[PDB]
Amino acid sequence: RGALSSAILSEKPNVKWEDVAGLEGAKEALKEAVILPVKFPHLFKGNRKPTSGILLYGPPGTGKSYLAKAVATEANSTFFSVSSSDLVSKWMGESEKLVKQLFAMARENKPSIIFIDEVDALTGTRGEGESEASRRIKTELLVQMNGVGNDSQGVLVLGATNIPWQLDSAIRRRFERRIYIPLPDLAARTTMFEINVGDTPCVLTKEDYRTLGAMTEGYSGSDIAVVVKDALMQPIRKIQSAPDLTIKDFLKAIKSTRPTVNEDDLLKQEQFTRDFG
Amino acid sequence: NKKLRGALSSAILSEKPNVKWEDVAGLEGAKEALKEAVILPVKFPHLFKGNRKPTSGILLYGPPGTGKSYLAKAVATEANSTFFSVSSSDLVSKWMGESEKLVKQLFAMARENKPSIIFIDEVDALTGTRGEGESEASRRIKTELLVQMNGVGNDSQGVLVLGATNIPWQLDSAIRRRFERRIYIPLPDLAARTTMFEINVGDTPCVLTKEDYRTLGAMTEGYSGSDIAVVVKDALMQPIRKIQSAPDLTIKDFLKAIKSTRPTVNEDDLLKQEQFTRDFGQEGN
Amino acid sequence: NKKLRGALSSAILSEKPNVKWEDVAGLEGAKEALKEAVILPVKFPHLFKGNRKPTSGILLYGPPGTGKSYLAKAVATEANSTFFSVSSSDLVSKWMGESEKLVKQLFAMARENKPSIIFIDEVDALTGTRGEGESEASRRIKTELLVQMNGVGNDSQGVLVLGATNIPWQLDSAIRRRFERRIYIPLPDLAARTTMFEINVGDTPCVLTKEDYRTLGAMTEGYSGSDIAVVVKDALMQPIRKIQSAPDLTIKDFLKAIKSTRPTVNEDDLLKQEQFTRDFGQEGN
Amino acid sequence: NKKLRGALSSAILSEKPNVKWEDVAGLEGAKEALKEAVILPVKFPHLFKGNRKPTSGILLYGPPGTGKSYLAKAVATEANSTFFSVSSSDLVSKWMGESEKLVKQLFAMARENKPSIIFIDEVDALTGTRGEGESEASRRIKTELLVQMNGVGNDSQGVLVLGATNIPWQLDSAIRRRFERRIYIPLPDLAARTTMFEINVGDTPCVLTKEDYRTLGAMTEGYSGSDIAVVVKDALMQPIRKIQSAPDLTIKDFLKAIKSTRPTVNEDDLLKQEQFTRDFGQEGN
Amino acid sequence: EKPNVKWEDVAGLEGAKEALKEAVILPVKFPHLFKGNRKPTSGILLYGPPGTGKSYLAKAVATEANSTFFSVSSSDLVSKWMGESEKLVKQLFAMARENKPSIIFIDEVDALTGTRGEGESEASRRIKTELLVQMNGVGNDSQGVLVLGATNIPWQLDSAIRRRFERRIYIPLPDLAARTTMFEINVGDTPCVLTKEDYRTLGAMTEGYSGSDIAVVVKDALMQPIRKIQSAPDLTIKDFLKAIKSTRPTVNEDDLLKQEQFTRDFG
Amino acid sequence: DEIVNKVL
Ligand SMILES: Nc1ncnc2c1ncn2[C@@H]1O[C@H](COP(=O)(O)OP(=O)(O)O)[C@@H](O)[C@H]1O
Ligand SMILES: Nc1ncnc2c1ncn2[C@@H]1O[C@H](COP(=O)(O)OP(=O)(O)O)[C@@H](O)[C@H]1O
Ligand SMILES: Nc1ncnc2c1ncn2[C@@H]1O[C@H](COP(=O)(O)OP(=O)(O)O)[C@@H](O)[C@H]1O
Ligand SMILES: Nc1ncnc2c1ncn2[C@@H]1O[C@H](COP(=O)(O)OP(=O)(O)O)[C@@H](O)[C@H]1O
Ligand SMILES: Nc1ncnc2c1ncn2[C@@H]1O[C@H](COP(=O)(O)OP(=O)(O)O)[C@@H](O)[C@H]1O
Ligand code: BEF
Ligand code: BEF
Ligand code: BEF
Ligand SMILES: [Mg+2]
Ligand SMILES: [Mg+2]
Ligand SMILES: [Mg+2]
Ligand SMILES: [Mg+2]
């Protein structure tokens, strides 16, 4: 009880659906799996059942955990952000009751969305793993994710990962909509600069943000959050050395900051998308 | 609970190694970034409000012996923040997920004692690209470090995570992502080498002039700061050798030492360092 | 804690192998460096004050059989310190990260009993460049040895870390950095060989003169000190054999032994030794 | 502790294979060295005092099937000392550095039972020149064998380490150094072959004379001792085939067997054996 | 383990049959002719091309032995865990020492023992070396065990292990009477109109086939009439000629040159 | 408690 109820968060990180830039298919699927069953529950009767598993995958730094924070603000659910630190134990027969308790308190708190972040650290193909941790966790989890007809309120199992090809095929089966979150294109990048400068006084125009968004092809949303961080530092450099925001501040930051993803990681991501996604 | 805090009570260091920002030679850029990520949030906390947030991760890399751990000692003296120095000996426990329960407890301590600094020395031994590693140590220590650094319900406010490494290309790309300013600490140039000789001789009586230190700094191209610390160590032994085979420090002592002592870093290691700097890195100047 | 010190209590050797500085032949330079790093700080501790610090790491390398472990026995007799003598059998363990709390509490033992000496015999088997090695043994024992030798909160005052190796080019560059005087122990020369015959015959009654030992030393070019120890062994077992085929020692006994006994080394191993000496090393004279 | 002694309790052999020195034909040099390293220290221990120490390592090498393991059985009968016939099955284990504690535990057992003999059969499977081998098995089993044979705090008094091999050129040079008398066991000559026929017929009723055995020994040039043991086996199995196929032994039985049985060795293997003997080796006569 | 398989059951090559009847039965039927210098044989390497009835002859010795029989093989001794592939060998010889007489049949010994000039350190030196030391060695006592072994590549075998196998017998492609016997056996008690001259005809027809191939032409010829039943009888010689036209063997006539090479040099 | 060992 009082050991897994440190999975419920309660601070509600204030990210709203108009802060993720782009990703409209992903917002569409998440709305029709989270918002719509609660708002019109009469529709889901007969053969029409809601979705009970969604995997988000992609390269590192593109929006997965952030979009999970957006769900955590907008859902009006009870939200378990559980992880591998909170399920595994020394004593044998504790990594059975811990998963079992997790889903039973999820059905105490219907509607429930449960965010098992980075599922490849729980579920590791069981050919080399140790007895306690790998086998009884993954088998009990497979069982309890075989609740198809009974889980019509409550459990929607999200999940994010960066290595989607190292995932067990039974668990690739359980996640029934593997959506791919890619590096962002032009309108999204321009939107992210306009968001991340916030309400800071700047002389920039729409064609300036348009210029920077044209300049930054290859960057994920993390990188643009840190070029806006560094460019917002640029006034205090112009006070220590010993003002407005210019465009030379952003050009300064973009010269200094260098991209993060490597262009063969994208080949294996596109591989998995073409084979299963 | 208290068993684990009894283990990690021996990590809050309490002695302040007296290295100051002038005992570091060279490195304008790395001192600059470290000052505006460590010193400046505490000294003027009213500035960092709104969109302007402090930096929450800094990776230092370079060839062996060029200043990384030493600059971390300079931060440890000048910061006025609690300075945790953790390592792989103190996280890998024997006991089924203590190596995740320990990590989570580490950052929980560094949130209850904010502002804090966590200095993970030689981060390439925890974080090894996870394509060949073993299940537990690999996926579970790397994964708890990832989720714990930014995650969902975790709030990395006011903690900073340093880290040094010599093999920056063997680092996992999610952890290359978490360290948001990869600064490169290079072999010293001419003015830096001359500065290091002038520092390391200290207040020892010597007949040397500015053109003598300038001469030696011209002589030693290829040496890191370790090597110049040991040629000053050996050259400071030269009066004892006189005073047994039978004073001042006089320039034949240093020429004697520089003839005997030979560089430590080769010249293809530098090619892969420059590779990583050109693909992902800053320039530490 | 105390389980691990209960394991490593059997490494602090205490029998003092009675080899004195006389009994080594040749190698004036290596004895000289070892004396001014081991004997002299204890005997005159007032000197080493200010910038003048003693040496804290010495690597001895060379071909097989030339004096490395023996010179370590000479230090173990003459030092008056707490000589440990550890090896790879005593640091690697079975239960998951026990193989580095051993490393840590080894060096913490040497700090509680300073001035200490740590003699890591054959260091190339612990420290293997970490580009192909396994996660636990490789990164964690090598990494804890690195951080523990200089590190941040660690204070290597008054401990000395020896180490011998035969493959000095297969050593990681951070650990090549930590060993700050790489001395090279070479195959012998004429005066050393003559000295080794005069030592190894001991107090055995022989008709030999100085020109006889001089003759044999001229005869044996290419032999290491092992080989001359076994030609003296065989030549001392010649008269017992003549007792069996039926006295003091003829020079024909030694010529007989030198004809029968054949050296150990070859002549491309020497090319890679000279390579490393020309790129990173000292000269052991 | 006792887990490991529970493993190595099955190495102290307890049956004394009754091979005596007379049975081993030829090879007087190898018997001579083995007697003066095994028999003579025990029988007259007053002699070995001062500088005169017994031999502590002997390597036997040769082509396959010439007498090495058999001569080790002769030592095992005639020695009157504790004999451990260890092998590669009894030293390697699965759990990360629990092989080394079996090596160290083997010599630490052997000095409880002094005088002792350790016979490592086919030492070329432990000790493989370390330029291509893997990290653990290579550096750690070879290194613990090195340090354990002479080392610093180790005291190889009263133990002897035998060892046989067929590939003596694939042996590491430090371990070529530790084995201080490399004796070469060759293919037998005429008198040895005649002796082996006379031994292997035993007390079986035969009409043969000395010139008959002399004839066969002249007939069989190129055969090792295995081959002559099997031509005597087949020639002794002729009469049973004359009971089924329907007595006394006449030379047509041996000519019959020698026509049917075909040799084992090949005349370039001998070139590399003679190579190693001419570069590093003794001569087993 | 004794199901049927007999000395009566096998076709051709009585040299192999008599060497083995000797080396197992002649000690077991008479343990009192082998005293003094006269000891039984303790290793026999059979080889040949595939299909020629090696392992079947081995299990004929299993039934026809009154002895224990351990039909381990090279598939079951490979591991990948640092010296596990040796304790398997050693405990195998422990249950063979404890249970005299015994027979150890290592099928396809060429997969353990690969001439050690290109192989890897551990598996090469350590499995080959533990097999050597374990077969004769010092403290080991190979009393009452017989180490068989079959192979198809006898020239890729290490010379120390060629030495340990002290009777390398060669199992060749068979003759006429054996093939006729194998057709008569494999048709069993199935109703057929065939005569002795019919089996004689087929045995004349099939030169080059091993015993596997004749077992599958009898398999196919027994499944011709059911095939004309359900996709629409008796057993004709045209059924067997039909099957022998369709079914093809494995072998090449240069493989035989290297087999004859090894037989002329060591066998 | 179920402790972890480590293999080769
Ligand atoms: N769609 C987005 N909208 C706004 N900010 C974004 C977006 N994607 C990334 N970012 C920025 O990058 C940060 C890192 O996002 P994060 O959740 O860590 O990504 P992920 O989990 O895929 O790696 C976000 O918190 C934000 O700072
Ligand atoms: N840039 C430098 N300025 C001053 N001293 C230096 C510098 N680099 C190295 N040193 C000296 O060399 C030693 C090696 O520094 P250290 O922090 O251990 O280097 P690192 O951790 O990169 O290998 C320091 O203790 C100091 O004595
Ligand atoms: N320089 C030397 N002076 C005297 N004896 C020496 C010398 N070098 C080697 N020896 C002899 O060599 C023997 C074995 O050498 P050893 O100590 O094993 O050297 P190492 O460990 O480098 O191989 C020593 O026991 C000693 O008898
Ligand atoms: N010189 C010899 N004298 C007597 N018997 C011998 C001799 N050489 C070989 N043998 C026979 O060889 C067998 C021992 O094998 P061995 O020669 O030890 O092989 P290896 O020497 O390759 O280990 C015994 O059968 C023994 O009868
Ligand atoms: N020469 C033969 N005589 C009798 N039966 C044979 C012969 N060759 C093969 N067989 C039959 O074919 C089957 C397979 O033979 P097998 O011995 O496994 O082939 P291989 O010798 O290639 O391993 C056996 O059960 C055997 O009865
Ligand atoms: F895509 Be992130 F790195 F979770
Ligand atoms: F930390 Be150093 F560069 F070895
Ligand atoms: F030089 Be020795 F072999 F340690
Ligand atoms: Mg994330
Ligand atoms: Mg450092
Ligand atoms: Mg040594
Ligand atoms: Mg043998």
Numbering used by the authors:
A (entry chain A): 116 to 357, 399 to 433
B (entry chain B), C (entry chain C), D (entry chain D): 112 to 357, 399 to 437
E (entry chain E): 126 to 357, 399 to 433
F (entry chain G): 165 to 172
Published text:
ESCRT-III filaments stabilize highly curved membrane necks that resolve by fission when the filaments are remodeled by Vps4. Vps4 is monomeric or dimeric at cytoplasmic concentrations, but forms a hexamer when active and recruited to ESCRT-III filaments. The Vps4 N-terminal MIT domain is followed by an ~40 residue flexible linker and an ATPase cassette that comprises a large ATPase domain, small ATPase domain, and a β domain.
We have now determined the Vps4-ESCRT-IIIpeptide complex structure at 3.2 Å resolution. Vps4 subunits A-E form a helix whose symmetry approximates a 60° rotation and 6.3 Å translation between adjacent subunits, and provides the binding surface for the ESCRT-III peptide. The peptide adopts an extended conformation that resembles a canonical β-strand (phi −92° to −151°; psi 102° to 189° (−171°)) and packs closely against Vps4 subunits A-E. Two distinct classes of side chain binding sites propagate along the pore. Odd-numbered ESCRT-III residues (D1, I3, N5, V7) bind in ‘class I’ pockets, while the side chains of even-numbered ESCRT-III residues (E2, V4, K6, L8) bind in ‘class II’ pockets. Class I pockets are formed by pore loop 1 residues K205 and W206, with substrate side chains sandwiched between W206 from successive subunits. The class II pockets are formed by the pore loop 1 M207 residues of successive subunits, and are flanked by pore loop 2 residues of the first Vps4 subunit and, to a greater extent, by the pore loop 2 residues of the preceding subunit. The refined model indicates that the NH groups of the even-numbered ESCRT-III peptide residues form hydrogen bonds with the main chain O of Vps4 K205 (subunit A, B, C, and D distances are 3.1–3.5 Å). Nucleotides primarily contact one Vps4 subunit at a subunit interface, with the β-phosphate and BeFx contacting two ‘finger’ arginines, R288 and R289, from the following subunit. The bound ADP·BeFx mimics ATP binding to subunits A, B, and C, whereas subunits D and E appear to bind ADP.
